[PDB]
Write an enzyme that holds these catalytic residues in place. Structure first.
Site, PDB file in Angstrom:
ATOM      1  N   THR A   1       0.728  -1.283   0.362  1.00 39.35           N
ATOM      2  CA  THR A   1       0.185   0.134  -0.157  1.00 39.35           C
ATOM      3  C   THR A   1       1.058   0.974  -0.044  1.00 39.35           C
ATOM      4  O   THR A   1       0.758   2.184  -0.627  1.00 39.35           O
ATOM      5  CB  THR A   1      -0.466  -0.308   1.237  1.00 39.35           C
ATOM      6  N   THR A   2       1.764   1.109   0.988  1.00 40.04           N
ATOM      7  CA  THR A   2       2.512   2.576   1.109  1.00 40.04           C
ATOM      8  C   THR A   2       3.478   2.142  -0.326  1.00 40.04           C
ATOM      9  O   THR A   2       4.022   3.787  -0.186  1.00 40.04           O
ATOM     10  CB  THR A   2       3.670   2.354   2.245  1.00 40.04           C
TER      11      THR A   2
ATOM     12  N   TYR B   1     -13.460  -3.113  -2.991  1.00 36.01           N
ATOM     13  CA  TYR B   1     -14.612  -2.533  -3.890  1.00 36.01           C
ATOM     14  C   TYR B   1     -15.126  -4.180  -3.875  1.00 36.01           C
ATOM     15  O   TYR B   1     -16.376  -3.960  -3.284  1.00 36.01           O
ATOM     16  CB  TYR B   1     -14.147  -1.964  -5.410  1.00 36.01           C
TER      17      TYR B   1
ATOM     18  N   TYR C   1      -3.524 -10.037   3.495  1.00 35.52           N
ATOM     19  CA  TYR C   1      -3.185  -8.876   4.339  1.00 35.52           C
ATOM     20  C   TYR C   1      -4.321  -8.030   4.434  1.00 35.52           C
ATOM     21  O   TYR C   1      -5.384  -8.146   3.680  1.00 35.52           O
ATOM     22  CB  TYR C   1      -2.770  -8.297   3.372  1.00 35.52           C
TER      23      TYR C   1
ATOM     24  N   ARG D   1      -9.458   0.569   3.859  1.00 33.56           N
ATOM     25  CA  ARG D   1      -9.989   0.673   2.641  1.00 33.56           C
ATOM     26  C   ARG D   1     -10.347   0.424   0.976  1.00 33.56           C
ATOM     27  O   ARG D   1     -10.537   0.308   0.787  1.00 33.56           O
ATOM     28  CB  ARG D   1      -7.764   0.111   2.188  1.00 33.56           C
TER      29      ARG D   1
ATOM     30  N   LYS E   1      -1.052 -10.149   7.661  1.00 35.55           N
ATOM     31  CA  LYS E   1      -0.660  -8.677   8.039  1.00 35.55           C
ATOM     32  C   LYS E   1      -2.424  -7.804   8.567  1.00 35.55           C
ATOM     33  O   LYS E   1      -3.079  -8.538   7.892  1.00 35.55           O
ATOM     34  CB  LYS E   1       0.065  -8.077   6.568  1.00 35.55           C
TER      35      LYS E   1
ATOM     36  N   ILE F   1       4.419  -4.815   9.797  1.00 33.19           N
ATOM     37  CA  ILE F   1       5.033  -4.568   8.203  1.00 33.19           C
ATOM     38  C   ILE F   1       4.646  -3.277   8.100  1.00 33.19           C
ATOM     39  O   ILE F   1       3.689  -2.445   8.343  1.00 33.19           O
ATOM     40  CB  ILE F   1       4.001  -4.948   7.269  1.00 33.19           C
TER      41      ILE F   1
END
Ligand SMILES: [K+]
Ligand SMILES: [K+]
Ligand SMILES: [K+]
Ligand SMILES: [K+]
Ligand SMILES: [K+]
Ligand SMILES: [K+]
Lengths: 292, 292, 292, 292
Positions: D44-45, D107, D133, D138, D161, D203
């Site tokens: 993501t980062t 989504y 994850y 999100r 995660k 993480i």
């Protein structure tokens, strides 16, 4: 009786925290002159949480006395113990009030069956009309439409003050109840929307300081004149919002003092005096509404 | 004693809703025998909402009398009006209670500053230790770590019963208070996790029916033996969840009746009798814990 | 064009997961015969998430071809990278579609400034009308009214699909935009309420299987006949709800198959086949609507 | 390596938004020198949302090349379509990555069964270790402990995660999986608490600028030295919070630029440049951590 602009009136206090009769009379005269439809005495905005039942009853009776038949008075009668709600309601039996505003039990988080038994027991111990009151952000409990339907079958349960701000509730409730069950908003910022969907009025904080404007808005709504009503709403929207900048009734009491409607803005702990930043915010909203 | 397994004890009632001394005696003896650290009298689980202040005081005094010095008693003393909390507190001065459990004002949603003033005033007017109680799902307000930090500087504010179930609160509060300030979980299902992060114990519903296993779980946790404690927690987890399958204390009072610890499972409205499906769920959880 | 009952059409598939032309033609003929105002091709209900951009474009172009000028087609063109949204939109420039439905970036949670720059950049690279689409439960992002106001100043941003189910948004948005900016519901269960407040139609899941009823409801709404519209709504409410019993479009595809509108109810992973319990629930809702 | 301080590394970009190899080299050298356990590439980062699959693969390969065997690389490989996740995974087979970080579909909100099928299919088609994850804020969906338990039976699904920040998940998952299944925090602000409850590492975004302190914090935590770890955590807490003051990775890329670790703070739309107020907040947090 139970439509139009209903004020949830502040319980004005002196500096010691006790009801100020001269202030209360000034407010009531204001609501008569302004076209307010009814007064809710010792609701949430009236500090029901911090009056004892004697003090509460005294305010209701003083409000009735001062109203002098010019404007109907609905008493706050909620409690989170059924026995206590019954006792409080019985104080007003034959008093002159036109009905009772009874909040769902707070803190104890009853089931829907519990809410049904609570309000049914209260309704059975009075001849007074009962307006249910749902405000889950305060109580931890949500009186759902199905249960409002069940309760609307009790002869003297005649309406609901819906303070969720969830406008889907208007038609969910309306479809389960008779045509004469009254739907009232308890959320100023959404109340014009609530009336547009079919509701019959609002029990309002804003009406404490913009009584004429609120009455004019609600009349236009009832007549189906929404665009004209919305102009008034837009002028009032900063009050509808900023009268909750700090916990209600901290801002509205300050605003009442600023307008000369009450002598002091004192409240009871744990409500605390308005902050400087709060005064500036509320002052701006009053200016926007053309009140200052 | 303000660490370990503390029971939020039921207020056992006869069929009329009046306190059953014989049933209370049996519970108190059970807790003394089972190693419970302390008894919270007329907490949430004790139906503080539906007892009046006189009946509440009677139950605390009866609990003290029956305890007979064998186990410490903490009284529920919260209110939503600061004056009423002070008044109630005074009733217990020199009673024999070791401390008070004082809930954030419910329904009226005070600011953080309002909470600060509220609790500071209560603490000022007693020499009894005060344990703050945060339960936002019931009250509508959330006493945040920063305000707990300010209050912990008051000499007799000595801990907090944190019932958010939000485990990040443990170390947010710990870092703002002294090493001797007590953190106690008010959420059975997350209480072992709460202790693992640095909490000192739990004010528990589950302990009403699993007192010995709760006492050993909390001891193992205090000793750092978390793996061992977690075996016990796993056997108790269905109770930690299903004691809330219907509003507390409806399930735990039924469980106490089923085990024979109390004569009747009666509660005060707006609490209602357990449903059949709830009896089945609760019984299953009791059997999982090895109690029936 | 952009008012009335707009179907978010399913992308019917064969057993392999690829578009089924015969099914798509059957649906489109159905929407022409039923009075559907427009078709949204490859929106959420059309499985935009699991088509690649080539496959997506093929479905849109096939839908346009089959519509054969009888019914306007709006393409889904959203993406969570601005460059990608621009590329996807450019595929449809000069295609015959009448505009684009462009969802707020999902997953990456842009700021309101980000949302402004994203949609402004997309609008600048096309002449096609743009309908913003806000669905925070899916995207993690909420396009607030202030930002919709800012965007409505861009010439070809002409409306919004508001899928929050928060009816206060209707008048918040309407007051910040011109009289010709179109407000469409993206939440079937609240859409009649949304139109009653001032919205102009709905982009609907329910219209896939109750197209005639949806078109009749929306016409009545536009004419100000709310009570008649609500009778239709009440007959459809179990579909409005139960078409989300499992993740959309799992139920609506099943329902389309059951009605003989499509050959198979296949979807792409991670959407999975409807459960037996789901089929029974959806079947009951279809029966309530008088469709089976 | 799947324990300790793992950096979710930024994808440093030039002013055109293209990957800056020189800046990436500097970061990788920094992580090797500072004792970071592993690098998560295009998480993501790392702006997985706005890189296409080719650019994404390039960044992973460049990271592997620059690492030159000195630190393990884990690739972000998630997608919201199960076929696309499988496809992307294949690109990395025999690349040199040690594992894949695979996000729940965003989504489209699949069911638990849909998540199960999704991840099971991905795992089947690789021999690489997979780390699930979960980041509901999100994605719009929440991979629950029960489903994690089912997936952990798949031989190459080796950890999770968990980025809810809901600390109760640690032991809910632990009790359903084997002792060798890795639990890693994806929430910097609660990560030490996560490790104290039984998690194996983090993480991290913060590790991009405080790699040495993160590495030592995680080591102390793994050794049981939580008090010691918490001193470090307190110095890093403003970064753990304020790296999210505007959408990640906007703040951390600015921080990396300010420290000189990357040439530019450029990101891809819909991410936008840091605000002045955000620069002030982030800088203050850097100084609190002792980094400037
Ligand atoms: K009635
Ligand atoms: K009470
Ligand atoms: K203290
Ligand atoms: K426009
Ligand atoms: K993307
Ligand atoms: K495994």
């Amino acid at each position: 009786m139970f439509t139009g602009s209903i004020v949830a009136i502040v319980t004005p206090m002196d500096e010691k925290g006790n009801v100020c009769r001269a202030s209360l009379k000034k407010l009531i005269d204001y609501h008569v002159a302004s076209g307010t439809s009814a007064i809710v005495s010792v609701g949430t905005t009236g500090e029901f949480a911090t009056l004892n039942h004697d003090e509460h009853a005294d305010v209701v009776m003083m409000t009735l006395d001062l109203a002098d038949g010019r404007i109907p008075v609905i008493a706050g009668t909620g409690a989170n113990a059924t026995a206590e709600a019954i006792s409080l309601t019985q104080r007003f039996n034959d008093s002159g009030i036109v009905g009772c505003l009874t909040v769902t039990p707070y803190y104890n988080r009853p089931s829907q069956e519990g809410l049904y038994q609570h309000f049914k027991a209260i309704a059975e111990h009075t001849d007074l009309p009962q307006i249910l009151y749902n405000v889950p952000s305060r109580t931890g409990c949500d009186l759902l439409p199905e249960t409002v339907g069940r309760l609307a079958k009790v002869k003297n349960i005649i309406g609901i003050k819906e303070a969720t701000g969830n406008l889907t509730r208007v038609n969910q409730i309306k479809e389960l109840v008779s045509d004469d069950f009254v739907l009232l908003s308890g959320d100023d910022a959404s109340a014009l929307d609530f009336m547009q969907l079919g509701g019959h009025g609002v029990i309002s904080v804003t009406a404490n300081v913009a009584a004429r404007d609120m009455a004019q808005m609600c009349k236009l709504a009832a007549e189906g004149h929404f665009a004209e009503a919305r102009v008034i709403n837009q002028r009032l929207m900063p009050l509808h919002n900023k009268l909750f900048v700090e916990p209600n009734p901290i801002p509205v009491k300050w605003a009442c003092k600023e307008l000369g409607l009450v002598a002091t803005d004192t409240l009871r702990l744990p409500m605390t005096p308005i902050t400087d930043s709060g005064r500036e915010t509320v002052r701006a909203a009053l200016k926007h509404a053309g009140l200052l």
